[PDB]
Ligand binder design. Structure first.
Ligand SMILES: OC[C@H]1O[C@@H](O[C@H]2[C@H](O)[C@@H](O)[C@H](O[C@H]3[C@H](O)[C@@H](O)[C@H](O)O[C@@H]3CO)O[C@@H]2CO)[C@H](O)[C@@H](O)[C@@H]1O
Ligand SMILES: [Ca+2]
Ligand SMILES: [Ca+2]
Length: 605
């Protein structure tokens, strides 16, 4: 039977993409720890740019990798719709693709204008906290004729074109809209030549290293498949001759692999598959050979454990990308030896990621044996103090996310959230990986979990009030209260909070003589007390206007010290809210906290 349950892995991979969503989430949201976020995206330019996916463990919406991810996901669904159908994940794949494509449509207000980034890398990365309460400004960036971006425009064209093929039978109207958009974007990319990173501040994160030549071939091919227009195939084959050669020879690049930046490698296989020309077969063969048996004595580094390690960053992402394409190629090539070689290589690399390695551990969060528990992800972590170090363990399980893994050919790895090398996660990391999984499900099978996702429960009160006796007294009660917002299911703002402290009027105490004072109060200090009925009264502290959210030391809490002086006769032992308050700060269950008038914590009399 399947060495690993590929269907379950795919099922969880689809969940990962759902957890990366930005904007107003649907009613059917499966990720209980995710809520609405980035609701003001595009506002700075008068556009609705909400939606799309957060790139990695951060909250920037990087259009280049986002588009590539979409193209790769669509490609896998086209190659193996059966894998998706059998794992019962086809509806989730479509849902995910529709989500990102709806964003691309919004980001393309007119034929030659494409918004390629929402958020600033540096501003975004300086803060460590949940997406729902991001406190910083998020700038929108775009490319147009004045400052083009052929690479990102052609990639978005390819994503929309590829995706249209997936919706073709389901929603032909939607598929038509995507094709129309892809045509415009490609014309823009072809007419106004230029590297997008020269126009938008993405160079430090997703710089266009390879340039746009590869995207022109890639985009042309996909539009050909989506339209059936021969001119596109012609365009692709023409542009193919301008692809990068290697070092000193006239041999096209074969030492890297396909990823968010370089699509050359994908076109080798795609064109070979389409035309059957020896030209493409030679290129594709050379590349895949380098990753397996080597060419001219040179071969991609391999660990003793059997992992192909291309580079330090997202090592497993590269191996998985190659594995998917090797699986596709293995089907078109006739050579029995090459077919076996490429196919077996792909299965071995994916199996390594699922647990077949020297550590005997899965590299997919929430899957298999001894998986990573602390991926470098802000929202999954759920910090409320703007610290990557607290709490020790991530508060949520980011099911399905493939981590960077071993960055050196020695199979070494440490599950450490602070290691952005080994524990980084990203939308592009799961792209080739998912497509590979779909191919494997079709071949080896597997069964998805009937009840997934699990419903997580909070690790304690999320929004509450702690209290302690600040100064002991007989004619007064001085409390030191602390409002806390450590929410994570999902993280949410508390900007309209107030709390009540009930007390019973005592014999010999005139309510008119009761005073409430403070020497330190981050909220308002009331002048009077409120009579409920009989001898029941309450003091109300008003914190409306204070933004209490899980995003920093001072941000997540509000300190309130208040003294209720009643004079001789004052007796707190018959006071409702006094029950259980001691000398140590601890949750006060009898002090009720309200959010815009609605009880959120504590029990009233
Ligand atoms: O020159 C070698 C090949 O480079 C490819 O571009 C890669 C860059 O060289 C590499 O530094 C960059 O690393 C990224 C990584 O992709 C990203 O996922 C991670 O989060 O951050 C890294 C930087 O810190 O990756 C790109 C893409 O592989 C060219 O695409 C290729 O043509 C060229 O031969
Ligand atoms: Ca490129
Ligand atoms: Ca009393």
């Amino acid at each position: 039977e399947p060495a690993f349950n590929y269907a379950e892995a795919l099922q969880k991979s689809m969940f990962f993409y759902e957890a990366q969503r930005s904007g107003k989430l649907p009613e059917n949201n499966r990720v209980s720890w995710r809520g609405d976020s980035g609701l003001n995206d595009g506002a700075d330019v008068g556009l609705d740019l909400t939606g799309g996916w957060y790139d990695a463990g951060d909250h920037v919406k990087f259009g280049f990798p986002m588009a590539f991810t979409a193209t790769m996901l669509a490609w896998g669904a086209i190659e193996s719709p059966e894998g998706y159908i059998r794992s019962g994940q086809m509806p989730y794949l479509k849902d995910n693709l529709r989500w990102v494509n709806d964003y691309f449509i919004k980001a393309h207000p007119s034929p030659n204008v494409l918004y390629v980034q929402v958020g600033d890398g540096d501003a975004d990365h300086k803060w460590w906290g949940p997406a729902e309460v991001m406190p910083m400004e998020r700038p929108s960036f775009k490319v147009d004729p004045s400052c083009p971006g052929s690479d990102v425009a052609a990639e978005t064209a390819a994503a929309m074109a590829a995706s249209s093929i997936v919706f073709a039978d389901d929603d032909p109207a939607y598929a038509a809209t995507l094709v129309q958009h892809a045509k415009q974007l490609y014309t823009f990319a072809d007419t106004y030549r230029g590297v997008y990173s020269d126009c938008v501040p993405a160079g430090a994160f997703y710089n266009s290293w390879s340039g746009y030549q590869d995207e022109l071939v890639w985009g042309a091919y996909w539009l050909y498949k989506a339209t059936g227009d021969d001119s596109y195939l012609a365009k692709a084959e023409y542009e193919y001759d301008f692809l990068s050669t290697e070092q000193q020879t006239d041999l096209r690049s074969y030492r890297w692999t396909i990823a968010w930046d370089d699509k050359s490698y994908g076109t080798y296989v795609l064109l070979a598959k389409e035309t059957g020309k020896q030209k493409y077969i030679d290129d594709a063969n050379r590349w895949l050979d380098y990753w397996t048996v080597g060419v001219n004595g040179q071969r991609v580094p391999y660990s003793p454990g059997g992992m192909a390690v291309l580079d330090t960053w997202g090592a497993l992402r590269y191996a998985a990308n190659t594995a998917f394409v090797a699986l596709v190629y293995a089907k078109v090539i006739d050579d029995p030896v090459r077919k076996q070689r490429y196919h077996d290589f792909a299965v071995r690399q994916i199996n390594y990621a699922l647990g077949d390695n020297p550590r005997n551990s899965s590299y997919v969060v929430g899957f298999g044996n001894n998986p990573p528990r602390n991926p470098h992800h802000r929202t999954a972590h759920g910090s409320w103090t703007d610290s990557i170090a607290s709490p020790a363990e991530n508060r949520h399980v980011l099911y399905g996310a493939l981590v960077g893994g071993p960055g050196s050919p020695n199979d070494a790895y440490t599950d450490d959230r602070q290691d952005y090398v080994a524990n980084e996660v990203a939308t592009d990391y799961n792209a080739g990986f998912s497509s590979a999984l779909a191919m494997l499900v079709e071949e080896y099978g597997g069964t998805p979990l009937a009840d997934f996702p699990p419903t997580e429960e909070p690790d304690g009160p999320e929004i509450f009030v702690e209290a302690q006796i600040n100064t002991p007294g007989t004619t007064f009660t001085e409390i030191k209260a602390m409002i806390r917002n450590q929410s994570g299911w999902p993280a949410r703002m508390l900007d309209k909070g107030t709390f009540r402290y009930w007390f019973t009027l005592d014999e010999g105490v005139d309510p008119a003589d009761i005073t409430v004072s403070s020497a330190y109060n981050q909220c308002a200090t009331p002048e009077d007390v409120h009579h409920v009925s009989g001898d029941l009264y309450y003091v109300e502290i008003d914190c409306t206007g204070e933004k209490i959210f899980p995003g920093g030391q001072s941000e997540h809490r509000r300190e309130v010290q208040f003294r209720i002086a009643g004079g001789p006769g004052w007796d707190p032992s018959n006071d409702w809210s006094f029950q259980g308050i001691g000398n140590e700060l601890a949750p006060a269950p009898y002090i009720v906290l309200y959010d815009d008038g609605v009880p959120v914590w504590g029990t009233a009399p």
